[PDB]
Design a protein around this ligand. Structure first.
Ligand code: CHL
Ligand code: CLA
Ligand code: CLA
Ligand code: CLA
Ligand code: CLA
Ligand code: CLA
Ligand code: CLA
Ligand code: CLA
Ligand SMILES: CC(/C=C/C=C(C)/C=C/[C@@]12O[C@]1(C)C[C@@H](O)CC2(C)C)=C\C=C\C=C(C)\C=C\C=C(C)\C=C\[C@@]12O[C@]1(C)C[C@@H](O)CC2(C)C
Ligand SMILES: CC(/C=C/C=C(C)/C=C/[C@@]12O[C@]1(C)C[C@@H](O)CC2(C)C)=C\C=C\C=C(C)\C=C\C=C(C)\C=C\[C@@]12O[C@]1(C)C[C@@H](O)CC2(C)C
Lengths: 41, 113, 197, 224, 217, 226
């Protein structure tokens, strides 16, 4: 477990996790707010 | 197309909306939400990134083999610093006030003239 | 040490012995620690006295033929001039609310400045004009009877709130209906207190 | 000691071997009553189930037997709730339900408090003064108001014989009410009608004929 | 309570971290989880809360379906929420967020009792010191155990074993509920009566789902 | 010691463990109060924000309560400036804002000067002779003409109790004004009207019911209703 956790603690794996997290957040924001351009509350 | 209208957006001679970047002019014509508010928000997020990275750089150096912590990230420590960066400008200006934000020119690696 | 005991043969309470009006109780162990127990004692006596005032304000206006207790503060909605005991006080809800807020604020501020815990429980003096509880045994008996009547008035006030939430009919009419038709007039007959009759 | 064996030749369980209680026959293949506290709980639960089943079979049979004799017009037990809910003096179902729930909750709370600590209801002055005689002599057999005519202060042999009789008739009542439920779910008629049909035609009045009881047996029955 | 204990597979070597001290420890771990003591504590707490919620939900589903089959107007366990908030005085949005607000206190107290054992019972919550203290890792006790039959150690161990076994059984029961309601679109009690009516024919192979039929020959 | 714990079962910060400042509960998850001067500035800023929040919340509620009661006829807070500026004897908005900015610049400059050097505003002969009592007894507690009734001239236990009450009602007031802004933006009505709506219909009038506070919950509501 802890060896696999340290493998998951390596830089490419946590970078991949950040990549999926940020991409999914931005994609869901764009999907539920279709095409915004100007901040208007 | 409905949301781009009735929101202060204006277009010139082609129907493609234009954005006003000068503050003050955007403030007195309700164009601040075009770039003025997003630029402040991006500055806030970029300062969040910089403060989190600075905290991880400083907090992972007082230990044996800091490069090992750089290459294999301390995930609980990284998440703790991630959730502690919500007040990045306060800590940044306080580090500026106490002088720990900047290093003196005597301890800084410098190229020969 | 114990005046009574609900569910006789229960586990004895080593932290509730000298408390007046003690019937063991507290299976949730809320009375642990001396400071929290004293604070809960203050809360219990104050809430019992406020239940006394609420039950008085309900029943005195119910049995005098002046109306119910839900429609008694409704005149602020209507704007009609209030009436108390035929004295016909001309006060206004803005002035009433202001003087009530100020008076209760200063009164509870003075009450919170009691220093001694026993004085916060029972100060006496100016609050005891005649003082029939000068004898210590009479003091304990009066405290126990006050707590018993306060708990009974608390149950009465909760019943008032629940009954008038269930039906708009007044509680003295509810007692009359329970006397006339016991098995055909109760909380289960409404169908709102318990779903599915 | 033991009053017999539920199955001769079967080895008695260790917890059921050298005990002293009424209605003991070594019937525990699952060894559920191994713990003495669990054994006491199971004994008390069996006693109260047996008592309420005795009341049930009494109120089913004796008014039913009076109805079959023509003395009474008492209907069957599987529609008596609908009969009473449509009567002239029909108390609502909710009112009776809450009254029964409150009374039985009080009774079961007192019984549970006596079970957790035996003889703990004999503290003076808690319940109208007379509660000093509410002390439970045995787990499930308090006595006093529960036996005012005085059959409890007999010989110990008579006492255990009476306890064994109570347990035996109670178990018979429990299996009788199980049979009542099964016969209502299968035949759909009253138990007295089933007994009359078994007396008139023992072979025709059999659960093998009913397809609800043994599915697939009627298939063999019409196959021949 | 260890060593020569019945395992998930007779003859398989039990894991080193699974010594048999925990309740229901059959040495079942193909993925070698819960190796660390903190991970083991987290997994034990998660299994206990999942077990309690699974048993509660399966018992409620079974009671509602049994009452519906008896004649009471109760909906099926699937899509019960639709008629539920169709008849609820509390609409959706307010109800779920009220549930979340009511649940947040209990969940964070459980979490910080798991992280710090015995820290909750210090008078912070309404002056409770003796209570609100975790007797074990996933077994709080105190006011959640009003009657004290867990005082005896052997009785407590037997109760833990019974609870975890019934919890795993209810987990599989809920999974079966989901699977054969997606397969048959009927109540679990309806599936039970269909299985005990014609056992030789009605089964998981005659629902038209689970096993696919392509050639029909 | 500490008045209480904001998060039972959690480790208190090291700078907040032995601290005896009033209104402390170990609520520094971001570790911003580590520096002493930074902690002093944070305490002073919290006191200023809390005090102006209490003043604003009182001026919103009590006139609002009196208007909903019927005696007063002052407008609600979210439109009061617009109706006031439309009056025939109204001071212009720029003039009022400039006067407010100048007066607050003077006051906050005095506060800055007594913060950077404690008790430095008691320099002799600097404000018409009455500058003697213009000194800082504590951080955020100047006293003197700011306490004309002399309520703070009490034993330190009662003074600490008063400070705790002040900071607690202050934090409640800042939360209350944040709510005032938030559910004015949500409901579009006054706080007293929102309280009456929650009292009359608690389930149907909830922050999760309106789609402004939680976007997308209304879609789930009509999805379940269908
Ligand atoms: C314990 C977790 C939980 C689970 C497993 C379910 C299960 C289910 N819910 Mg119930 N609910 C849960 C959360 C909760 N639901 C509700 C109230 C509702 C409603 C009101 C609705 C359901 C819906 C559903 C269905 C989801 C269909 C789906 O996702 O297909 C894809 C299914 C019967 C829907 C339903 O009944 O339609 C099938 C629906 O609209 N749920 C509440 C209280 C507010 C919950 C609390 O945690
Ligand atoms: C560096 C220049 C730049 C800038 C200023 C923008 C800015 C924008 N683009 Mg663009 N874009 C860029 C580069 C840039 N993009 C590049 C390089 C590509 C090609 C990969 C695209 C491809 C692209 C597409 C295909 C779309 C946009 C959209 C958008 C909008 C952002 C929507 C979003 O992320 O959700 C908003 C998310 C947040 C505000 C994050 C909030 C997170 C927390 C809460 C803070 C915004 C107007 C979308 C849009 O709306 O068009 C106008 C859209 O459809 N852009
Ligand atoms: C150095 C970059 C830059 C440039 C070229 C401009 C250019 C302009 N600004 Mg801007 N401005 C800037 C930065 C800049 N601004 C910044 C950083 C701020 C502070 C946030 C402002 C605040 C500001 C205000 C408040 C106003 C302008 C106005 C103007 C206009 C006239 C300025 C003048 O002296 O007459 C012109 C379009 C004025 C305007 O819109 O025209 C009347 C005006 O009222 N500016
Ligand atoms: C059930 C009613 C009841 C009883 C028995 C008591 C009894 C007592 N209280 Mg209490 N009290 C009550 C209600 C009651 N109180 C209520 C409702 C309030 C709030 C207004 C208070 C407020 C109060 C204070 C502030 C103090 C007491 C004190 C006392 C003691 C004084 C005993 C005495 O001389 O008179 C014996 C009691 C009676 C003769 C009861 C007469 C009640 C009349 C008949 C009610 C008439 C109502 C009418 C129908 C309308 C005693 C322990 C004092 C104390 O203990 O100090 C040492 C003290 O300081 N009480
Ligand atoms: C203003 C800052 C602040 C914040 C952000 C919190 C936040 C929290 N407190 Mg805390 N609390 C605070 C001030 C605060 N409190 C103060 C001033 C006190 C008085 C000393 C408490 C006393 C307190 C107790 C006694 C408990 C909490 C608990 C909680 C949690 C409840 C979670 C939930 O769903 O609630 C909705 C949450 C993390 C609970 C908790 O986490 O238990 C472990 C709990 O039992 N709080
Ligand atoms: C925005 C105004 C404001 C400011 C400046 C402060 C500042 C402070 N508060 Mg406070 N707080 C506020 C609003 C504020 N609070 C509100 C609205 C609440 C209620 C939700 C609380 C609830 C609260 C608790 C429960 C506690 C504090 C504490 C603190 C200290 C923590 C210092 C810190 O982390 O950096 C300051 C943070 C920012 C500048 C952002 C500091 C004195 C802690 C304390 O007393 O430690 C000294 C403490 O226990 N505050
Ligand atoms: C933070 C403090 C604060 C602030 C900024 C304001 C701001 C304001 N108040 Mg004031 N007010 C406050 C506290 C405050 N109030 C308090 C504590 C009270 C006593 C409860 C009042 C009682 C009050 C009245 C009676 C009136 C105002 C009014 C006004 C508005 C015009 C100013 C005026 O004509 O004065 C005066 C302005 C928006 C006027 C207004 O437009 O009504 C809303 C008005 O008639 N205020
Ligand atoms: C992640 C999705 C999401 C998004 C995009 C928003 C967005 C918003 N919410 Mg919301 N909120 C969310 C989830 C979200 N919320 C959840 C999950 C909760 C429950 C805790 C809330 C509880 C909530 C409240 C209680 C309030 C908002 C408010 C707001 C507004 C504040 C920002 C603004 O207008 O400036 C904005 C419309 C505020 C509002 O109505 O603005 C006027 C407000 O008072 N939200
Ligand atoms: C419900 C309540 C308290 C409930 C407490 C409970 C359940 C305690 C719980 C436990 O004990 C249990 C159960 C069992 C233990 O294991 C655990 C604990 C924790 C020990 C208080 C209400 C307290 C309620 C109070 C004091 C209400 C007072 C109302 C007043 C005075 C109103 C005034 C008016 O009525 C007049 C006078 C005249 C009218 O015309 C007009 C109006 C305005 C309506
Ligand atoms: C089966 C299950 C989990 C199974 C996990 C398995 C096999 C894991 C296997 C392994 O880990 C081992 C062992 C060891 C590792 O080395 C290898 C792996 C492979 C990783 C969980 C179920 C968990 C199931 C739970 C918790 C069920 C909860 C049910 C609730 C709450 C019901 C609520 C209802 O809402 C509904 C759904 C509908 C409404 O009609 C009624 C109400 C009552 C409202």
């Amino acid at each position: 477990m802890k060896d696999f956790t340290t493998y998951l603690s390596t830089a490419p794996v946590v970078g991949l996790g950040w990549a999926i997290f940020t991409s999914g957040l931005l994609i869901e924001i764009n999907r539920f707010f279709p095409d915004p351009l100007v901040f208007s509350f | 197309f409905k949301n781009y209208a009735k929101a202060g957006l204006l277009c010139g001679n082609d129907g493609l909306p234009h954005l006003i970047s000068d503050p003050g002019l955007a403030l007195r014509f309700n164009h601040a939400g075009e770039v003025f508010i997003p630029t402040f928000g991006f500055l806030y997020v970029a300062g969040y990134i910089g403060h989190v990275g600075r905290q991880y750089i400083i907090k992972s150096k007082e230990d044996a083999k800091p490069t090992d912590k750089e290459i294999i990230l301390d995930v609980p420590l990284a998440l703790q610093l991630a959730f502690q960066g919500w007040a990045w400008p306060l800590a940044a200006i306080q580090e500026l006030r106490n002088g720990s934000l900047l290093e003196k020119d005597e301890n800084i690696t410098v190229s020969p003239r | 040490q114990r005046a009574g005991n609900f569910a006789p043969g229960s586990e004895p309470k080593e932290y509730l012995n000298d408390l007046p009006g003690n019937f063991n109780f507290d299976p949730l162990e809320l009375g642990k620690e001396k400071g929290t127990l004293q604070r809960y004692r203050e809360a219990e006596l104050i809430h019992c006295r406020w239940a006394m005032l609420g039950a008085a304000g309900c029943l005195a206006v119910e049995v005098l033929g002046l109306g119910n207790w839900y429609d008694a503060p409704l005149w602020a909605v209507t704007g009609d001039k209030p009436t108390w005991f035929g004295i016909e006080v001309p006060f206004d809800i803005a002035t009433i609310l202001g003087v009530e807020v100020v008076a209760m604020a200063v009164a509870e501020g003075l009450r919170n400045d009691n220093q001694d815990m026993e004085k916060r429980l029972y100060p006496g003096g100016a609050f005891d004009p005649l003082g029939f509880s000068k004898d210590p045994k009479s003091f304990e008996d009066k405290k126990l009877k006050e707590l018993k009547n306060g708990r009974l008035a608390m149950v009465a006030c909760l019943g008032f709130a629940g009954q008038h939430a269930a039906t708009g009919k007044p509680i003295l009419e509810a007692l009359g209906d329970h006397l006339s038709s016991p098995f055909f007039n109760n909380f289960a007959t409404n169908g709102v207190s318990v779903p599915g009759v | 000691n033991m009053n017999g064996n539920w199955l001769p030749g079967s080895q008695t369980p260790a917890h059921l071997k050298d005990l002293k209680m009424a209605g003991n026959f070594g019937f525990d293949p699952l060894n559920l009553g191994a713990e003495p506290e669990a054994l006491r709980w199971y004994q008390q639960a069996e006693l109260v189930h047996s008592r309420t089943a005795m009341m049930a079979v009494a109120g089913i049979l004796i008014p039913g037997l009076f109805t079959k004799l023509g003395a009474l017009n008492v209907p069957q037990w599987y529609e008596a709730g609908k009969v009473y809910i449509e009567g002239e003096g029909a108390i609502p179902f909710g009112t009776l339900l809450m009254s029964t729930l409150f009374s039985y909750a009080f009774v079961e709370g007192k019984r549970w408090q006596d079970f957790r600590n035996p003889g703990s209801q004999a503290e003076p002055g808690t319940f109208f003064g007379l509660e000093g005689m509410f002390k439970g002599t045995d787990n499930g057999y308090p006595g006093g108001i529960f036996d005012p005519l005085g059959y409890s202060k007999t010989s110990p042999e008579k006492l255990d014989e009476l306890k064994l009789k109570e347990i035996k008739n109670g178990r018979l009542a429990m299996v009788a009410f199980l049979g009542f439920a099964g016969q209502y779910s299968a035949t759909g008629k009253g138990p007295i009608d089933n007994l009359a049909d078994h007396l008139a035609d023992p072979w025709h009045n059999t659960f093998a004929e009913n397809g609800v009881s043994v599915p697939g047996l009627s298939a063999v029955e019409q196959a021949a | 309570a260890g060593a020569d204990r019945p395992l998930w597979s007779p003859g398989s070597q039990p894991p080193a971290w699974l010594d048999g001290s925990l309740a229901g420890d059959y040495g079942f771990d193909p993925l070698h989880l819960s190796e660390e003591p903190e991970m083991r504590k987290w997994m034990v707490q998660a299994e206990l809360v999942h077990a309690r919620w699974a048993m509660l939900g399966v018992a409620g589903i079974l009671f509602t379906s049994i009452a519906a089959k008896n004649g009471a107007p109760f909906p099926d366990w699937y899509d019960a929420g639709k008629e539920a908030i169709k008849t609820s005085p509390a609409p959706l949005g307010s109800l779920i967020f009220t549930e979340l607000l009511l649940f947040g206190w209990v969940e964070t107290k459980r979490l910080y009792d798991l992280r710090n054992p015995g820290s909750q019972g210090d008078g912070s919550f309404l002056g409770i010191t003796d209570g609100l203290k975790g007797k074990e890792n996933g077994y709080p006790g105190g006011l959640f155990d009003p009657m004290g039959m867990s005082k005896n150690e052997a009785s407590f161990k037997e109760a833990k074993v019974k609870e975890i076994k019934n919890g795993r059984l209810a987990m599989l029961a809920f999974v079966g509920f989901i699977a054969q309601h997606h397969a048959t679109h009927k109540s679990p009690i309806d599936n039970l009566v269909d299985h005990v009516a014609d056992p030789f024919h009605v089964t998981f192979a005659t629902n038209g789902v689970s096993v696919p039929h392509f050639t029909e020959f």
